[PDB]
Amino acid sequence: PNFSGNWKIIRSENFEELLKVLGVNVMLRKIAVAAASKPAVEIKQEGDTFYIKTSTTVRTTEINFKVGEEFEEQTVDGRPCKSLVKWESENKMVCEQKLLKGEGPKTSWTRELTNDGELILTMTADDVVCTRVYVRE
Amino acid sequence: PNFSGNWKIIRSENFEELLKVLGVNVMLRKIAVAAASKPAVEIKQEGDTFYIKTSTTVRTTEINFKVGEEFEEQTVDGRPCKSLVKWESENKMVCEQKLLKGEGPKTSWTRELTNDGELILTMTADDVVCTRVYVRE
Amino acid sequence: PNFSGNWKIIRSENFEELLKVLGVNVMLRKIAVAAASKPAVEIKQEGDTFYIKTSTTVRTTEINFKVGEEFEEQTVDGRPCKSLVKWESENKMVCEQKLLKGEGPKTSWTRELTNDGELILTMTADDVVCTRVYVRE
Ligand SMILES: C=C1C2=C(C[C@@]1(C)C/C=C/C(C)=C/C(=O)O)C(C)(C)CCC2
Ligand SMILES: C=C1C2=C(C[C@@]1(C)C/C=C/C(C)=C/C(=O)O)C(C)(C)CCC2
Ligand SMILES: C=C1C2=C(C[C@@]1(C)C/C=C/C(C)=C/C(=O)O)C(C)(C)CCC2
How far apart are alpha carbons A94 and B136 in whole angstroms? Answer: 33
Give C114→chain A minimum CA distance, Å.
Answer: 32
Domain ranges, residue A48? 1-137
How far apart are alpha carbons B34 and B24 in whole angstroms? Answer: 14
Q: How many separate domains does chain C show?
A: 1
Query: On the CB side of A82, how many CA atoms lie within 13 Å of its CA?
Result: 8
DSSP B72-135: EEE-TTS-EEEEEEEESSSSEEEEEEEESSS----EEEEEEE-TTSEEEEEEEETTEEEEEEEE
Cα C34 to ligand 3 centre (Å): 9
Please name every residue paired with A73 in a beta bridge, in sequence order, or none if there are none: A81
Q: Which helix (H) or strand (E) holds C34?
A: helix C26-35
| Contact residues, chain B, for A101 at CB < 8 Å | 6, 137
Q: CA angle, A24 as apex, A20 and A25 as ends, to 5°? A: 100
Q: CA angle, C61 as apex, C56 and C63 as ends, to 5°? A: 140
**Could you say which DSSP state residue B69 is in?**
B
CA–chain centroid gap for C121, Å, is 6
Q: Chain B neighbours among C 15-44 (CB < 8 Å)?
A: 30-31, 33-35, 37, 40
Ligand nearest to the CA of A122: 1
How far apart are alpha carbons B116 and B113 in whole angstroms? Answer: 8
The verdict on a CB contact (< 8 Å) between B28 and C55 is: no
CA–chain centroid gap for B30, Å, is 19
Other Cβ atoms within 10 Å of B88 Cβ, number: 11
The verdict on a CB contact (< 8 Å) between C59 and A55 is: no
DSSP B8-46: EEEEEESHHHHHHHTT--HHHHHHHHHHTTS-EEEEEEE
Give C120→chain B minimum CA distance, Å.
Answer: 21
CATH number (domain holding residue C136) = 2.40.128.20
Of B31, B40, B55, Cβ closest to residue A27? B31
Look at residue C97 and give its three-state secondary structure.
Answer: strand
Q: How far is CA B131 from each of CA A3, A48, A74, rounded to the nearest angstrom?
A: 48, 48, 28
Ligand 1 surroundings by CB, under 6 angstroms = A 9, 19, 24, 28, 31-32, 35-36, 39, 54, 56, 58-59, 76-78, 132; B 57-58
Amino acid at A27: M
Q: Which helix (H) or strand (E) holds C18?
A: helix C15-21
Please name every residue paired with A8 in a beta bridge, in sequence order, or none if there are none: A135
